[PDB]
Amino acid sequence: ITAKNVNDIKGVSVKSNPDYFGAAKGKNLIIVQLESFQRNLTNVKINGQSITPTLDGLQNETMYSNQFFQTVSKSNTADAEWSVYTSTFPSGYYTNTQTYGDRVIPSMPRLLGKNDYKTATFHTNDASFYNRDEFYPAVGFDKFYDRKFFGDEDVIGFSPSDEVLYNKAFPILEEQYKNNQKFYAQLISVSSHMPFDIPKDKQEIDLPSDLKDTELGNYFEAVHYADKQLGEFIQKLKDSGIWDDSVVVFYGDHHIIKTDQLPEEQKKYVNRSTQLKAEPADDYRIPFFLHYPGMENPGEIKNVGGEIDIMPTVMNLLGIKTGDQIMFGTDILNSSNNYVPERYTMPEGSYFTNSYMYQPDESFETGAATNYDGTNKELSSDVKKRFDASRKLLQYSDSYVNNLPLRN
Amino acid sequence: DITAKNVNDIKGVSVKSNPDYFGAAKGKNLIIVQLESFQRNLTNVKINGQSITPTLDGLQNETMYSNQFFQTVSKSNTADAEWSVYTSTFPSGYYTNTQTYGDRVIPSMPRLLGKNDYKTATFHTNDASFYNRDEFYPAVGFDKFYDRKFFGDEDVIGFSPSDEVLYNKAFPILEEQYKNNQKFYAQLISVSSHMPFDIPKDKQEIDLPSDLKDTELGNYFEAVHYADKQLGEFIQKLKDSGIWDDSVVVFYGDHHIIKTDQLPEEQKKYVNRSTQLKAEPADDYRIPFFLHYPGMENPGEIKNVGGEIDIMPTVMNLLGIKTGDQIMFGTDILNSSNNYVPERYTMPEGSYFTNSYMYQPDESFETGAATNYDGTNKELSSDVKKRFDASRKLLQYSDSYVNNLPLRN
Ligand SMILES: [Cl-]
Ligand SMILES: [Cl-]
Ligand SMILES: [Cl-]
Ligand SMILES: [Mg+2]
Ligand SMILES: [Mg+2]
Known part of the structure; x- marks a missing residue:
C-alpha cells in the first residue's frame, strides 16, 4: 500500500500544481474541535437571539463549508480526532484510539514536528478517556494538556468549562508566539457535550415555551455558551497578534440532534437555508471554518469534505510536502469532485458527494442514491x-x- | 442467549421465591397516573400553611408509598419514563428508545396484561406524534391510545388540554368498561405541570410569598398544586363510582425538574428535608410513588428502593400474573430488600442508588465515590x-x- 495507490483508488482529481500552496508557510496552526455542533443548528435565531453569533460572524472573513461531513463510528469524539490527526478512517468495529494506541502512527502532529512545529493538544477531561494518554503519544503530539493541567474550577458537565479551556490554553500559545516557536495547538471543547446541562447563571437564551425542558432547548443553551467562549478566545488571538500569524480551523466533531425526529413544532428551529433533503446527510453536516493570514478569497467552499480531509487541506496551506505519507483524505481546496465514505451507522460503501448520497442495502443494486x-x-x-x-x-x-x- | 434468569442473576437482587402479596389484587383493574415533573423533595411542602400536594399527603395513610423511589430516564425524559415503566428495560444512553424502537414488537406490561383479559389504553392530551408515541404505543401492544384528537381544545393549559380535561374525558371510558365487566389497564400521562408551569390566573390557588412570586419555583408550586388538585378530583370519582375499590392504582412522578442545589439561597428553605438524601443528584432524582390496592392491610412506607423500571414486576405480582420467560430488568420491590437502581446519561455508566448510598465512577471504579x-x-x-x-x-x-x-413488519 502506497500513497499513490490510495489516491488512485479514491479517484478524486487533485491539481498537480496546487493553489494556495504555502499561502501560510511558516505560520502557526490552531484547530478547535467543537463538541456536538452541527451545521443545520448553527446560524439560527431564537426570537431574535443568535445561537452561534461567533460562527455567523466568521462567514465574512473565512473559507467555510455548508457541505462538510463528520467521518466517525462507534466512539464519535475520539473517531473525529482519529480522522483529523491520521487522515485514515475510523474502524467499523474498534475504537481506533484504544486498539491502536500502541502503534507509531503517521499523522499531522508528527509531520508538523518534522517541520519545526511544537505540537500540543488540550482537553479538560482526564486523558485516560478513550485511551488518549496512549493515543496522543502514538500520533506524536509533543504534549497533551488534560484535567491535571486544568483545575476543577468552573466545572460544566463532568469537567472544566470551555472558558477554562481557552483561558488556560491561551497563555501557553502566547508564550510560544513571543518566543518565536512555531506551534500547532489542537483544542477539544466539551461544554456542549450531552446532556447539555449548563449552570443556570450561564444560560443566556430566553427560550420559548416549546423549547423549555426539551433536549433541543438545552442543546441550544449549551451551543450558545460554547460559541460565546469561542468568540472570547478568538478576540484574544486577534489582540495578541496570533490570529494574523496563524492558520485557524474550526469544525464540529459530529452531530447530536436527529432533526427529523424532533417534535413537529420544534422543526421550525432547524436551519433550512442549505438543507440536504436526504438523511442522514443533512444531520451529518458539521460546521467548518478556515482562516489564514492574507486570505483574499473568503466565502463558501463548493467542494465537499469530511474530517479525514482536514490534514491534506492544511498541509497544503502550510507549504508542507507529505511525500510518501498515506492519506485517505483529499486537499479540498484543490479538487472539485471529492466524496466522503461513511460507515458504522451506514453500511460499507455508503458515501456523500456534492449533489447526492448513496447507501447500499443487501447489495449495490438494492441500494438507493438520493439527490x-x-x-x-x-x-x-x-x-x-x-x-x-x-x-x-x-x-x-x-x-x-x-x-x-508497534511503539515497543 | 439472553434469558430472564440470566438477567436476574446479573442484577443479583434477592427476590422471594414464594412472593408475598401474589395475586392480592388478582382480577382487579389497573390505573397508573404518571405525574409530570413531580419530585419527592418538593412534595408534602407547606407555603405559609398552604399544602402544595394535599392529595398525595392524604394518600400516605392509605397506600404503600416510597420516599426513595427514583427516576430512570435519559435523553427524552417523559418518554424515557414511559419506556421504563412499560418495558422494564433501561432507556438508552444514546437513542430515544420510543423513536428508535417504535418499529419493534416489544414485550411489555400492556402486552402481557392483554394476554390476561385486560383491555389496555393510554391517555395524554397532546398530539401522539410527540416522541413517536403513535408508533411506540402499538409497539408495546396498547390496544388504544387517546391523544389530542380525542380531548378537543377546551381548557388548554400550556400547549394542550388541562389535567382536568384529561381526567374528565378518561373517566367515562373507564366507567363503561367497569360496568361491562371488562378488566382494564389505563395509563394516564399528566401535562399541566410541565415547564414553564404556566397556570391560568383563576386556577392559581397558592398565595405566594415575595421570594417565590413570579419565579420558576413559584410557578412550579402553583402548577404542581393544580395538578395535585385535579388528581384528587379524579380519585374522588374513582371512589364514588366503585372503580377505586376494584383497582390497583399507582401514581408516580416522571422525573425531577428543579435542581434544588441551584435554587436561590432564600428559596432553599422550601425544599422538603424530612427524607433528604445528602448526596446529589440522588436527592433530586427521587420521584413520588404511591400504590393502592383493594383490601390492603399494610399501608405505609416501602423501605426497599425502586425505580421506574421496577413498576412492571411489582404490579404483575400484585395482579397474580406470572411473567414466565419475559425478560425484566426491574425487580418486584415488595419482595426484595436489597434492590438498587442503575443510572445513566446524566451520570456515568455504573452509577447507582441503593437504600443507603449512591455510587458514581470517575475515570475508573477506584477513582469514583460512594456517598452515604x-x-x-x-x-x-x-x-x-x-x-x-x-x-x-x-x-x-x-x-x-x-x-x-x-421487527413489526
Ligand atoms: Cl421510602
Ligand atoms: Cl431512550
Ligand atoms: Cl432497579
Ligand atoms: Mg463529541
Ligand atoms: Mg416529563
Missing part, C-alpha cells in the same frame, strides 16, 4: 464506481492501520 | 464494586436485548 433535492438518482456507472472505491478505501485504510509498527 | 445518604463517605468495598460491575453489565444487556427485538 440533495430529495429525488431519487438512478444507480449509474459513476454511482457504482464510487461505491466500489469507497469499500476498497475502507479495506485499505483498515489494513494499513492494522499493519502499523 | 447521611452525607458521609463510604469506602469502596467489594459489594460496592459488585453493584458497579452489575450495573454496567445490566445496561449492556438491556441495550443488546432491546436492539435485537423483532
Whole structure:
C-alpha cells in the first residue's frame, strides 16, 4: 500500500500544481474541535437571539463549508480526532484510539514536528478517556494538556468549562508566539457535550415555551455558551497578534440532534437555508471554518469534505510536502469532485458527494442514491464506481492501520 | 442467549421465591397516573400553611408509598419514563428508545396484561406524534391510545388540554368498561405541570410569598398544586363510582425538574428535608410513588428502593400474573430488600442508588465515590464494586436485548 495507490483508488482529481500552496508557510496552526455542533443548528435565531453569533460572524472573513461531513463510528469524539490527526478512517468495529494506541502512527502532529512545529493538544477531561494518554503519544503530539493541567474550577458537565479551556490554553500559545516557536495547538471543547446541562447563571437564551425542558432547548443553551467562549478566545488571538500569524480551523466533531425526529413544532428551529433533503446527510453536516493570514478569497467552499480531509487541506496551506505519507483524505481546496465514505451507522460503501448520497442495502443494486433535492438518482456507472472505491478505501485504510509498527 | 434468569442473576437482587402479596389484587383493574415533573423533595411542602400536594399527603395513610423511589430516564425524559415503566428495560444512553424502537414488537406490561383479559389504553392530551408515541404505543401492544384528537381544545393549559380535561374525558371510558365487566389497564400521562408551569390566573390557588412570586419555583408550586388538585378530583370519582375499590392504582412522578442545589439561597428553605438524601443528584432524582390496592392491610412506607423500571414486576405480582420467560430488568420491590437502581446519561455508566448510598465512577471504579445518604463517605468495598460491575453489565444487556427485538413488519 502506497500513497499513490490510495489516491488512485479514491479517484478524486487533485491539481498537480496546487493553489494556495504555502499561502501560510511558516505560520502557526490552531484547530478547535467543537463538541456536538452541527451545521443545520448553527446560524439560527431564537426570537431574535443568535445561537452561534461567533460562527455567523466568521462567514465574512473565512473559507467555510455548508457541505462538510463528520467521518466517525462507534466512539464519535475520539473517531473525529482519529480522522483529523491520521487522515485514515475510523474502524467499523474498534475504537481506533484504544486498539491502536500502541502503534507509531503517521499523522499531522508528527509531520508538523518534522517541520519545526511544537505540537500540543488540550482537553479538560482526564486523558485516560478513550485511551488518549496512549493515543496522543502514538500520533506524536509533543504534549497533551488534560484535567491535571486544568483545575476543577468552573466545572460544566463532568469537567472544566470551555472558558477554562481557552483561558488556560491561551497563555501557553502566547508564550510560544513571543518566543518565536512555531506551534500547532489542537483544542477539544466539551461544554456542549450531552446532556447539555449548563449552570443556570450561564444560560443566556430566553427560550420559548416549546423549547423549555426539551433536549433541543438545552442543546441550544449549551451551543450558545460554547460559541460565546469561542468568540472570547478568538478576540484574544486577534489582540495578541496570533490570529494574523496563524492558520485557524474550526469544525464540529459530529452531530447530536436527529432533526427529523424532533417534535413537529420544534422543526421550525432547524436551519433550512442549505438543507440536504436526504438523511442522514443533512444531520451529518458539521460546521467548518478556515482562516489564514492574507486570505483574499473568503466565502463558501463548493467542494465537499469530511474530517479525514482536514490534514491534506492544511498541509497544503502550510507549504508542507507529505511525500510518501498515506492519506485517505483529499486537499479540498484543490479538487472539485471529492466524496466522503461513511460507515458504522451506514453500511460499507455508503458515501456523500456534492449533489447526492448513496447507501447500499443487501447489495449495490438494492441500494438507493438520493439527490440533495430529495429525488431519487438512478444507480449509474459513476454511482457504482464510487461505491466500489469507497469499500476498497475502507479495506485499505483498515489494513494499513492494522499493519502499523508497534511503539515497543 | 439472553434469558430472564440470566438477567436476574446479573442484577443479583434477592427476590422471594414464594412472593408475598401474589395475586392480592388478582382480577382487579389497573390505573397508573404518571405525574409530570413531580419530585419527592418538593412534595408534602407547606407555603405559609398552604399544602402544595394535599392529595398525595392524604394518600400516605392509605397506600404503600416510597420516599426513595427514583427516576430512570435519559435523553427524552417523559418518554424515557414511559419506556421504563412499560418495558422494564433501561432507556438508552444514546437513542430515544420510543423513536428508535417504535418499529419493534416489544414485550411489555400492556402486552402481557392483554394476554390476561385486560383491555389496555393510554391517555395524554397532546398530539401522539410527540416522541413517536403513535408508533411506540402499538409497539408495546396498547390496544388504544387517546391523544389530542380525542380531548378537543377546551381548557388548554400550556400547549394542550388541562389535567382536568384529561381526567374528565378518561373517566367515562373507564366507567363503561367497569360496568361491562371488562378488566382494564389505563395509563394516564399528566401535562399541566410541565415547564414553564404556566397556570391560568383563576386556577392559581397558592398565595405566594415575595421570594417565590413570579419565579420558576413559584410557578412550579402553583402548577404542581393544580395538578395535585385535579388528581384528587379524579380519585374522588374513582371512589364514588366503585372503580377505586376494584383497582390497583399507582401514581408516580416522571422525573425531577428543579435542581434544588441551584435554587436561590432564600428559596432553599422550601425544599422538603424530612427524607433528604445528602448526596446529589440522588436527592433530586427521587420521584413520588404511591400504590393502592383493594383490601390492603399494610399501608405505609416501602423501605426497599425502586425505580421506574421496577413498576412492571411489582404490579404483575400484585395482579397474580406470572411473567414466565419475559425478560425484566426491574425487580418486584415488595419482595426484595436489597434492590438498587442503575443510572445513566446524566451520570456515568455504573452509577447507582441503593437504600443507603449512591455510587458514581470517575475515570475508573477506584477513582469514583460512594456517598452515604447521611452525607458521609463510604469506602469502596467489594459489594460496592459488585453493584458497579452489575450495573454496567445490566445496561449492556438491556441495550443488546432491546436492539435485537423483532421487527413489526
Ligand atoms: Cl421510602
Ligand atoms: Cl431512550
Ligand atoms: Cl432497579
Ligand atoms: Mg463529541
Ligand atoms: Mg416529563
